[PDB]
Design a protein around this ligand. Structure first.
Ligand SMILES: [Zn+2]
Ligand SMILES: [Zn+2]
Length: 582
């Protein structure tokens, strides 16, 4: 408690010594409360006018239009201590999993140089605005790095002064850039060196890309076993136990020298003990603490969520296969059985899963998995939208399974080659492309964000009639040489000024390991769509009068946007489609 967090607490006290007060009407039950001080401040979702002017039929679809308008009683809940049998299963599995992940990788520190290059091309590193304006500026000033130095030597000394969380089913904890550096220095290797790649982790999909995920689920489907299970956890980040944070910290067992000590400090001082500032309207800032739940950077959060989810799902597989009988207590011979299962079939069982942070798909040995719930519930990973002891419902068809907000279609090209393509309800895709985040967007910057969405649709969602047409319209309406942008950036092959047919060939044919025949595609007309009825099932407006008038009159919409942007060099991409090709 207060020895590890006191100094952070003491320091904040004094920068608002005029305002400090132990409020007696504080709302916190599960968070330790420490005090309050004076503040007054809040970024809402703005419409992208380039995308909206070129998607007129969707102006009357509430599922699209409502997306642009507008639980903190889950961050204030408490998960119970798992039983001794559960704690043993987790410690054995975590020990084995770090060794497997470490067999072909070397833990290492990430560098000021690496951190600097990141900030100078806009990665979402969840920092705050004070002393310098942006992250770009702090990184060039040696004063910052002296602040970083003071904190760093404090961490070597087992103490913390400035690593404090700022709060804002989504809750995002920003820290100052300095704290973020020290986190990246110690733990950035997990992401920078692809510890959760599929090649390295067998269950993971880190760096795959949406073009690969369907083929990965189809490969899992080829395994002998039961249904495919895709159970979502209710508020994953809020169910991370102190026991989970201690098994995650065992990655430090693979480290040495300075790095080992820097990583141990991040886990001890910032993860297993946290200090947070929260805005309360009654407007004060509350300084609250707790030991458990997830609050790291979003990129370290991804890797440790993937790790702990891989661990949880192997244990659920062990329960289904009868490896242990009860979570109350592991016998000595059950430990040896668990250890032996991991050595004998561990890697095979990892290959039966696709895991992306809190999201999983599991094809177990058989359907005993469906009712194997005691370890999963006791670890605190309670399933969303099903009663605690009701058996899981599995999927019989890999094309039905939800994963990373998508499902996947098998689509046969006119030449017999097989594409496995990503898909989701088209209202969600159009509604997201119609939204920008933040202020001071020029017309040019708004156009270049529209072009990013359009090129993503050409690469990932070409099989949806409405999105191929809208993508071609947006790319016709935005000057041909303007570079696609995004303020928060998986593999993003659409972020390029290269011709999209050349990029399509490189991704779906040349690089595709599932595609044996490498014959390039010569035109967009060779590239197939879903069935017309399947396109409608997934939200197409094909067949509506509104959509027919939009498609027929698209050159008028393209010309409206060109007239707003002004006299620039444009390309007509509409004749790449059969119906505009005269
Ligand atoms: Zn610190
Ligand atoms: Zn679909």
């Amino acid at each position: 408690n207060l020895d590890i967090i006191g100094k952070r607490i003491e320091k904040i006290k004094q920068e608002h010594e005029t305002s400090w007060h132990y409020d007696q009407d504080h709302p916190y039950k599960t968070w330790a409360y420490h005090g309050s001080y004076e503040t007054k401040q809040t970024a809402s979702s703005m419409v992208n006018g380039v995308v909206r002017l070129l998607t007129k039929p969707w102006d009357i679809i509430p599922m699209v239009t409502q997306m642009a308008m507008t639980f903190k009683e889950k961050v204030d809940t408490r998960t119970q201590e798992p039983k001794e049998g559960t704690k043993k299963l987790m410690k054995i599995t975590a020990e084995w999993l770090w060794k497997e992940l470490g067999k072909k990788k070397t833990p290492r520190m990430c560098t000021r140089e690496e951190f600097t290059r990141k900030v100078r091309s806009n990665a979402a590193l969840g920092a705050i605005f004070n002393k310098w304006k942006s992250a770009r500026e702090a990184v060039e000033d040696s004063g910052f790095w002296e602040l970083v130095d003071k904190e760093r030597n404090l961490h070597l000394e087992g103490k913390c002064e400035t690593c404090v969380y700022n709060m804002m089913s989504r809750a995002i904890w920003y820290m100052w850039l300095g704290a973020r550096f020290l986190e990246f220095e110690a733990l950035g290797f997990l992401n920078e060196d692809h510890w959760f790649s599929r090649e390295n982790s067998l269950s993971g999909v880190e760096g795959e890309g949406l073009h690969k995920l369907g083929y990965i689920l189809r490969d899992v489907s080829k395994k002998e076993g039961g249904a495919m299970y895709a159970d979502d956890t209710a508020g994953w980040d809020t169910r991370i136990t102190l026991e989970d944070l201690k098994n995650e910290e065992m990655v430090t067992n693979h480290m040495e020298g300075e790095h080992k000590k820097l990583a141990e400090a991040i886990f001890k001082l910032t993860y297993q003990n946290k200090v947070v500032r929260v805005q309360r309207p009654t407007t004060v800032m509350d300084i609250i603490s707790r030991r458990d739940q997830r609050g790291s950077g979003q990129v370290v959060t991804y890797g440790l969520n993937t790790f702990t989810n891989m661990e949880a799902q192997l244990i659920r597989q062990m329960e289904g296969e009868g490896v242990f009988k009860s979570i109350q207590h592991l016998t000595v011979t059950e430990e040896i059985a668990v250890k032996n299962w991991l050595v004998r079939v561990g890697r095979e069982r990892l290959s039966r899963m696709a895991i992306s942070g809190d999201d999983c798909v599991v094809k177990p040995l058989d359907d005993r998995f469906a009712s194997a719930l005691t370890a999963l519930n006791d670890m605190g990973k309670v399933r969303k939208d099903i009663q605690q002891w009701e058996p899981s419902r599995g999927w019989n068809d890999w094309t039905q399974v939800p994963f990373c907000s998508h499902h996947f279609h098998e689509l046969i090209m006119k030449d017999g080659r097989v594409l496995v393509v990503p898909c989701r309800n088209q209202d969600e895709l159009i509604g997201r492309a119609r939204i920008s985040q933040g202020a001071g967007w020029s017309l040019r910057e708004t156009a270049c964000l529209g072009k990013s969405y359009a090129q993503m649709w050409s690469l990932m969602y070409f099989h949806r009639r409405d999105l191929r047409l809208a993508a071609n319209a947006i790319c016709s309406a935005v000057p041909s040489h303007w570079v696609p942008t995004s303020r928060t950036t998986a593999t993003h092959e659409w972020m390029t000024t290269e011709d999209m047919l050349t990029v399509w060939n490189r991704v779906w044919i040349q690089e595709n390991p599932w595609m044996e025949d490498k014959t390039p595609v010569e035109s967009w007309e060779e590239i197939p769509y879903l069935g017309k009825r399947e396109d409608q099932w997934c939200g197409s407006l094909i067949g509506l009068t509104s959509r027919a008038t939009w498609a027929k009159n698209i050159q008028t919409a393209i010309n409206q946007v060109r007239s707003l942007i002004g006299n620039e060099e444009y390309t007509d991409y509409m004749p790449s489609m059969k119906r505009f090709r005269r």
